[model samples]
Target: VNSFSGYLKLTDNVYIKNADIVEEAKKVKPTVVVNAANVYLKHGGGVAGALNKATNNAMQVESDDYIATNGPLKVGGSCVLSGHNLAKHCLHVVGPNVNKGEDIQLLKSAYENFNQHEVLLAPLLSAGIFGADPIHSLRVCVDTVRTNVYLAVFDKNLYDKLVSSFL
Candidate 1:
């Protein structure tokens, strides 16, 4: 049995799943995929790295080109880029680094900025290297995003916690 296959309903159209977001993106091909990106928009590691790898490094080049022209994405800001081998577009949102005393509102902005998309696949922003608590991040994600979302969570322990608390 796949323990992680179960999903938790957050709202009428929002759901959380214990799954690899990149693999889910490959399978579902949502209208947009969200990357928990750095302000620099470097897809060098974490979820950003996985998505870039899945796109065969094309995303990295695109990101570099974008930064070269438009400058670094600001905290809580977002931009859309071509989603090679995945979805139609990738929404890169810079989540706040809580360890740096960045406000929770910045993380809320990351999720709020995704309202334009119909179907979005996203991860728990700022909950990884950015040092936001997983459950707090999950709550912010659930409360803010206004579109249909598949919240794909990769960590088994975090997934279990979400399932236990919210399922």
Candidate 2:
């Protein structure tokens, strides 16, 4: 076996946040704020509801159009939300359902869609309702997003260790 001693380098593009996405997103001001979405686009709880309110419920109209034509977004596919009260363009990424237990791969697929954008904000997808482990989900998200992706957290210390590893 060869004896190379190089370690994997973590990218500095990802940042952790412990504030409300609506308030914090305004401050960080990402070009696109990605929300975990349901195909129904009913403005459901967690990130979806928050995003629905943030954009003055405009997410539904956009998602409605998408579902009508596309018949629900796949795990990797996403729909855009724009031209509403919010300045930041929104990306509704279809996250996996926890009951079905398709968590990790789903998050990876969802995040991979936005590598070219300058900035992205993502919530802890499938963690709460889907019963996905928050830390594990975050690890997957950090691993998947190639470019800069800012994560919204309830508290910074929650994932401080995990975040440090990728920093």
Candidate 3:
């Protein structure tokens, strides 16, 4: 049985302002931050600023925990950002972005990459998926992704389902 006795899940709406992620980081002792936000860096609203500031502060911790940005985080597929943006620990996805980038190719590659894997992680509102002019991006991700995947909306269920199902 898959016995992940120590698993903590942050709420769906839990932003940087809640300190939930920070707390989770401390508990899980994550060596890398696997962030899957839309990556647009939303503005406005009191909470937005605070969360952005908090995320920035967390980024400056100077720890070994590498933060890898996926999806539309780095403008969809601008690998250059992943190269020049050394200040932030993010890996630019070298795939597709449509008019702006090569998003179609990325989706195809994502499906192929999972032939040997079972699960993966993705964001809720990935502009790339939507912007790619089809809902199939995510569908392919789930179907061809081998098995289950971690989504922003399925925050709690992911941990609970995966952990308890095995136990």
Global lDDT for candidate 2? 0.66
lDDT (Cα, tens digit) per residue for candidate 2, span 23-94: 666655666777777766667788778767777766777777867877866755677777244436777777
Model 2 ranges with Cα > 4 A deviation: 1-10, 155-167
TM-score per candidate = 0.91, 0.78, 0.35
- Candidate 1 whole-model C-alpha lDDT, 0 to 1: 0.84
Ranking by TM-score: 1, 2, 3
Residues 14-112, candidate 3: write the lDDT tens digits. Answer: 111112332333333322222322234331222222223445644323211232333233333222121111112222222343545545556555334
Number of the top candidate by lDDT? 1
What are the per-model C-alpha RMSD values against the true structure? 3.4, 7.6, 10.3
Clashing pairs in 1: none
lDDT of 3 at 166: 28
Query: Mind giving the per-residue lDDT tens digits that candidate 1 earns over 47-107?
Result: 9999999999999999999999999988999999998888889999889988778887788
